[PDB]
Design a protein around this ligand. Structure first.
Ligand SMILES: N[C@@H](CCC(=O)O)C(=O)O
Ligand SMILES: [Mg+2]
Lengths: 77, 31, 162, 43, 264, 226, 438, 221
């Protein structure tokens, strides 16, 4: 199975991410909350990045790839 | 919107904004 | 999705067309505003036979109920405003409760008290969808239903649930 | 943005505060209220 | 951060004078930072869509030709506004909620909006249309002559198209090792273990073959001339059977091929 | 005048397919040498392939087989996939003949002269029970693709794929400059016959072009560029 | 032209867009036009007309003098680079030589958008009506880079800036070159008074006129007052309010007007000095600019391609502009296709070359239209102009380019060669010359 | 069925400015893509001499008139664009033009410095009268293609200097056509003729060789 190699913002696919949360809006908060987390760590919630980050990756993009790999929960209140 | 609050819809709903995000105990270890 | 704001999506789904509407925007506003129809059309108040009488270039429709009880008569109706089609209504035909007796627009308030709330929403969605479909626009019924739902939310003695 | 920090939580739009004053000028007493029912100084 | 400027006031002076050092920097900050595009009047939500910015020359905004349908944007002095989402939540909502390639179907009828239109329609129509009596036409000659209308593969047919031997819109028969047959033919012609990577010969125009190379390898062979309605059928069908990214990229390929053959 | 820093890189898709890039190029050199490269790859390289064939039992009857599974048309296009590098420089007749139920392949044919078949596992036909097959093959080197060229009865001229490159496609992107307006970037995608590898085919193409453009260089050769 | 062939919608648009054109530096007249081209220019008043029959005495870029039969001299001073009310260039240029003899009412100098007496609101460009790789799509347009190199669609634009020095309550504003806190380099283009020198360049944010106003009470910052004591720069008593160039605007300084209170200039009460700087700029036709023809067809410039890769005739003559095909049929402005055919006829010339007599189509054609050399101008009044039969016949009469080869067939198409790949375009493509406006 | 014959170079002279070329024999399909691959390089990369900036003593910018002359300055600049100039000097050289009195100022009145030459003296530059006197120096540089006027800001140029668009294109007009031999399925060959025209700066043989030599350099393994 192959769709193709995605470019930039379209990676990772939204479909593979939606399997990790309930709705698209939940997914938004997920990456957002984690994005602030990573940035706080760069200028010391302080954890990660769990995945090997390519240089200059926007912490939002890092948080998305984290959710792709099931690396974080992910509890809804 | 008038007072500048989050609209009670989409990402403004309570169940979505109060989410807590932490790495799994398994994930933090692997680093 | 859970958070979807379908009310706005519906208002825009219905709002984007209308630049394509040219039997148009006036009729659409008349329906959503629930005004008395521009040219009012009668609906059957009860099911039964229909006796079609022709006055001096007038139309006089009487309904002999199947009870059979008190006849239901419609006194004066312009002959220039044609009758509904099943062909066109004729003497002796059978009519059900909510049927449209003549071509035109049924008073949404009248169909309300006759058929009840559940049907008013169906009548309005049909009439509205008839306009947009006549101009060629494709809109899903649920958007109109979202709007129409907001019209029957209250009851005269106030919101329903409250 | 210059310090590269997270972006802060927004405040009260000045337009809204101006709206409250414009209502007061019309002899309309508008009060922002919390759960307690206590008035809140808009300043 | 880099030692180009010692303090902020030097950086601000640098940018205002358009110092050449800032250009390569701008690419780094713009990378994967979405921007919102909008055209007035805003009739539906698809009137605002997020995109990935690309530093381009000139003072005009380059807009993807597919989103023209959603924006109702014709290129006659038409202007559009740009908005920069700042907060992490704002960028997340842009990349997730308002991304261009995630909003294909009109949220009124479910029909596809990024579906190809005027120029690309005629291009694909000409590409898949079938011409009687075209160059390279297959006749399946019988008496003292072989068929002489078949080709070893779509690649050989291309070499025949570059020479004056073949026409793109000719009825021909070739065997495809990387495409999937239709449902009826896949069932009977193929032992029901699978039907990938196995040679099978069907008779269609070379154009229709190159056309089906744009659709996913997993999609059946269509073998029709692409009226605009037929294109809506396939994209509607693709939304059901495939994720959005598959649809987004496929319509991108349909754009490149539609335009190419639109000029030809 | 002299400009700087054009390069050539290759990403291998498979043992038969290789992708190449040129970075960077001055506008608009992408389209200039782009279509010329692909055209050179297609119809310039010398290669050996089948020209005509004749099979015993094939006659006035249009196309049917006395003892195999697929019609003669299907076998023709099967044979068109035969890759054979030859050193004869002229038409040479190969010999293939098999009997008994089984599957015939490329290995079932003896290489007469300068011939080394490069795809022995290639299928040709599945033989009927107690089936025999007798057929000749005319192989001559050549360039590119020549359609079936049509004294002899039962002689079937076939479309001949001389070149080792089956398909080459190209497109030009634009990126990689600081203040410039998106210098050209060339992408070429070539699928190889296994007779030669892609980069040798590209190297041969370049050698053919440079020798072809030295035609104009040898005229004056004084005015030049990088 | 061909007004009778266009719907009132696009015709209404075409009429509105003629008054939207801008004066080009070249100001070439329309190859295919109507009668009104001449009279509209002279009656507009932007053209220099001789009111007495005479002979020219002197011809200068500044002025021109003409001696009449009366012996009385008339002289006309030329507007050279006058800024219009909307920023367009009102330059005038003489069309007569020294010893030429003129008649009363004749044209002596061309206006901004006139040539030889008739309005020239645009240029004549080689057009191809094929769709081209989507770069011309949904009314967009692609052009030859020639239009940049050869300044054909280049148009000069001037802007007027203004700053005044008045008497404030705290003190009098002074136009001066001394600015509180600035490098000497930002002043390097200013003169003594503090105004930008003539012929100097201007980049957005640069200084045109240095002006200063009193400031008090200072009450500076404790953090700032220390830096003043360290580096010894006295905190100046006045605030910097200088006239700078607006963002994105650029060009060169043409002239400066200065009205001063010291000299007995008339000023409004409280205003001492007034200085106005006039900046002009050359505008190469650029991506995103809006072009249009006389038939209500309009579109932005989507891309400008190098002359090398452009659909070109077998001559090697590249087309200047490529117009999408899909926008032509639906809008009922097909009159633009007619002037495209006539446009090629006019630039190529023709000779009916009657076998025996005027072929049956030319029954109504005037004899003067039978022959015509290359580059001839044509006039087709709106409701009695050229008609279809005459056009095809004129399309059948054409002339070789240089060699015997003919470049456009009887239905007005030509086999174009793709400049990118090199292989020709499969189908004959309609080419011609269309008059388009910036 | 390889046919072995070295691709030949035949040259023809159609005129003084342009001269035809023909190449044969070539494989089928090469005629069009190869001729255009030369054409694109001819128009874009042929090096030449072009006037970069010019100066007129009386004027400080290009938007003023000169007393006695019939053309305004920016009109003179547009007339100066047509100049076809050849400069063997690698570095920037400054020509001069001084003329006065009634008459016509052609391109020939320009005095070239050591090593450069003007190839179209007949060009009308300006027309002067009794009161008109014209002094102008022109800076000639070497390059290729079309470079827009370099603003005097990017350089340390004087306020009197007038930058001008520069067109280094010795080639005027170029095309091609193919005579293709597709006989009775025997020895199909391609014959391609190119029609190269120059501006008299360099002869077509020399420009084609320059482009051809440049093409050779880019094609590499
Ligand atoms: N804040 C939302 C919460 C709704 C929900 O998540 O259930 C309301 O009000
Ligand atoms: Mg528009």
């Amino acid at each position: 199975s192959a769709y193709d190699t995605p470019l930039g913002i379209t990676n990772p696919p939204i479909d593979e991410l939606l399997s990790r949360a309930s709705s698209k809006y939940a997914l938004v908060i997920y990456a957002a909350k984690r994005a602030r987390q990573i940035n706080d760590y760069y200028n010391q919630e302080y954890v990660g990045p769990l995945v090997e980050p390519g240089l200059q990756e926007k912490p939002l993009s890092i948080a998305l790839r984290e959710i792709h790999g099931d690396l974080l929960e992910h509890t809804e209140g | 919107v008038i007072i500048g609050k989050l609209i009670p819809a989409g990402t403004g709903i309570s169940r979505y904004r109060n989410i807590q995000v932490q790495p799994t105990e398994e994930a933090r270890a692997a680093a | 999705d859970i958070g979807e704001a379908v009310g706005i999506v519906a208002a825009q789904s219905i709002g984007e067309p209308g630049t394509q509407l040219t039997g148009g925007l006036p009729r659409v506003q008349e329906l959503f505003e629930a005004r008395v129809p521009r040219n009012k059309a009668p609906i059957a108040d009860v099911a039964g036979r229909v006796r079609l009488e022709e006055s001096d270039k007038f139309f006089k429709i009487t309904i002999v109920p199947d009870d059979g009880g008190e006849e239901v008569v419609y006194d004066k109706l312009s002959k220039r405003q044609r009758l509904r089609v099943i062909g066109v209504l004729s003497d002796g035909d059978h009519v059900e409760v909510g049927d449209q007796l003549m071509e035109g627009a049924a008073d949404p308030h009248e169909v309300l008290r006759v058929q009840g709330p559940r049907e008013v929403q169906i009548h309005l969605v049909k009439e509205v969808q008839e306009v947009y479909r006549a101009q060629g626009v494709s809109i899903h019924d649920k958007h109109i239903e979202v709007i129409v739902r907001q019209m029957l939310r209250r009851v005269t003695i106030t919101e329903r649930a409250e | 943005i210059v310090k590269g920090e997270n972006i802060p939580e927004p405040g009260i739009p000045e337009s809204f505060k101006v709206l409250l004053k414009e209502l007061q000028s019309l002899c309309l007493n508008v009060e922002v209220l919390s759960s307690d029912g206590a008035a809140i100084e808009m300043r | 951060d880099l030692n180009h400027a010692q303090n902020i006031k030097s950086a601000k002076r640098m940018v205002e004078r358009q110092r050449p050092q800032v250009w390569d920097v701008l690419e780094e900050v713009i990378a994967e930072h979405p921007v919102l595009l909008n055209r007035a009047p805003t009739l539906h939500r698809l009137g605002i869509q997020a995109f990935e910015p690309q530093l381009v020359e000139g003072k005009a905004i380059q807009l993807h030709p597919l989103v023209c349908e959603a924006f109702n944007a014709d290129f006659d002095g038409d202007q559009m506004a740009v908005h920069l989402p700042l907060s992490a939540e704002a960028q997340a909502e842009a990349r997730i909620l308002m991304l261009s390639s995630n909003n294909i179907l009109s949220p009124a009828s479910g029909k596809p909006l990024a579906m190809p239109r005027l120029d690309m329609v005629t291009g694909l129509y000409y590409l898949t249309t079938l011409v009687e009596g075209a160059t390279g036409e297959y006749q399946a000659a019988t008496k003292d002559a072989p068929e002489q209308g078949v080709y070893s593969s779509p690649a050989e047919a291309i070499m025949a198209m570059d020479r004056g031997a073949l026409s793109v819109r000719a009825k021909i028969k070739v065997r495809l090792t990387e495409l999937r047959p239709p449902t009826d033919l896949e069932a009977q012609l193929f032992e029901n273990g699978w039907k990938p990577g196995d040679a099978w010969t069907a008779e269609t125009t070379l154009g229709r073959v190159m056309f089906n190379e744009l659709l996913p390898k997993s999609y059946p062979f269509v073998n029709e001339q692409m009226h605009k309605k037929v294109q809506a059928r396939i994209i509607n069908d693709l939304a059901e059977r495939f994720p959005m990214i598959v649809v987004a990229q496929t319509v991108d390929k349909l754009k490149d091929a539609g335009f190419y053959w639109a000029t030809r | 005048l002299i400009s700087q820093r054009p390069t050539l890189s290759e990403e291998t898709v498979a043992e038969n397919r290789s992708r190449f890039v040129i970075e960077p190029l001055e506008p608009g050199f992408g389209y200039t040498l782009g279509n010329s490269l692909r055209r050179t790859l297609l119809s310039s390289i010398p290669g050996a392939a089948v020209t005509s064939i004749r099979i015993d039992g094939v006659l006035h009857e249009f196309t049917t087989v006395p003892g195999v599974k697929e019609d003669v048309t299907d076998i023709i296009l099967n044979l068109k996939g035969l890759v054979v590098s030859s050193d004869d420089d002229e038409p040479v007749t190969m010999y293939l003949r098999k009997q008994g139920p089984g599957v015939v392949t490329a290995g079932d044919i003896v290489p007469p002269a300068g011939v080394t078949v490069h795809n022995p596992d290639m299928h040709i036909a599945t033989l009927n029970d107690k089936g025999k097959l007798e057929v000749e093959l005319v192989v001559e080197r050549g360039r590119g693709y020549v359609p079936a060229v049509q004294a002899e009865i039962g002689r079937i001229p076939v479309d001949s794929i001389y070149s080792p490159v089956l398909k080459v496609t190209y497109k030009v992107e634009a990126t990689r400059v600081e203040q410039r307006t998106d210098f050209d970037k060339l992408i070429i995608d070539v699928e190889t016959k296994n007779s030669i590898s892609p980069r040798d085919a590209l190297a041969s193409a370049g050698g053919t072009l440079v020798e072809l453009f030295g035609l104009a260089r040898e005229l004056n050769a004084d005015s030049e560029h990088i | 032209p061909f007004l009778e062939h266009d719907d009132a919608n696009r015709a209404l648009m075409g009429a509105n867009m003629q008054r939207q054109a801008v004066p080009l530096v070249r100001s070439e007249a329309p190859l295919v036009g109507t009668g009104m081209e001449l009279r509209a220019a002279i009656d507009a008043g932007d053209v220099v007309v001789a009111d007495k029959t005479g002979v020219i005495e002197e011809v200068s870029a500044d002025y021109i003098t003409v001696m009449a039969d009366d012996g009385t001299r008339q002289s006309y001073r030329l507007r050279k680079f006058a800024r219009s009310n909307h920023g367009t260039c009102a330059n005038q240029r003489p069309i007569v030589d020294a010893g030429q003899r003129v008649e009363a009412g004749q044209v002596i100098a061309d206006g901004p958008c006139t040539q030889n007496g008739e309005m020239a609101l645009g240029k004549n460009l080689l057009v191809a009506i094929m769709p081209w790789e989507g770069h011309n799509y949904e009314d967009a347009i692609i052009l030859s880079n020639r239009l940049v190199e050869e300044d054909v669609l280049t148009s000069i634009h001037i802007e007027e800036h203004e700053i005044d020095a008045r008497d404030t309550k705290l003190g009098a504003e002074e136009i001066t070159r001394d600015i509180p806190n600035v490098s000497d380099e930002v002043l390097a283009d200013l003169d003594e008074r503090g105004i930008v020198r003539i012929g100097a360049e201007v980049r957005d944010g640069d200084i045109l006129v240095g002006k200063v106003t009193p400031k008090g009470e200072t009450e500076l910052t404790p953090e700032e007052r220390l830096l003043r004591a360290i580096f010894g720069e006295k905190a100046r008593e006045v605030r910097d309010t200088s006239l700078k160039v607006p963002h994105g605007e650029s060009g060169k300084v043409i002239g400066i007007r200065v009205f001063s209170r010291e000299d007995d200039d008339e000023l409004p009460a409280g205003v001492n000095e007034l200085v106005r700087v006039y900046v002009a700029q050359k505008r190469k036709i650029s991506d995103g600019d809006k072009l249009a023809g006389r038939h209500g067809n309009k579109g932005v410039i989507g891309k400008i391609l190098p002359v090398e890769d452009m659909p070109f005739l077998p001559d090697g003559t590249p087309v200047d502009i490529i117009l999408n095909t899909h926008g032509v049929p639906r809008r009922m402005n097909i009159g633009q296709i007619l002037e495209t055919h006539l446009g090629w006829v006019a630039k190529a010339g023709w000779n009916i070359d009657v076998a025996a007599g005027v072929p049956d189509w030319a029954s109504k054609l005037p004899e003067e239209l039978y022959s015509a050399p290359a580059d001839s101008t044509v006039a087709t009044p709106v409701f009695d102009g050229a008609q279809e039969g005459e056009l095809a016949g004129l399309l059948g009469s054409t002339l070789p380019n240089r060699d015997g080869e003919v470049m456009v067939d009887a239905d007005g198409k030509s086999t174009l060669f793709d400049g990118r790949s090199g292989e020709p375009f499969p189908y004959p493509v309609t080419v011609g010359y269309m008059y388009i406006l910036k």
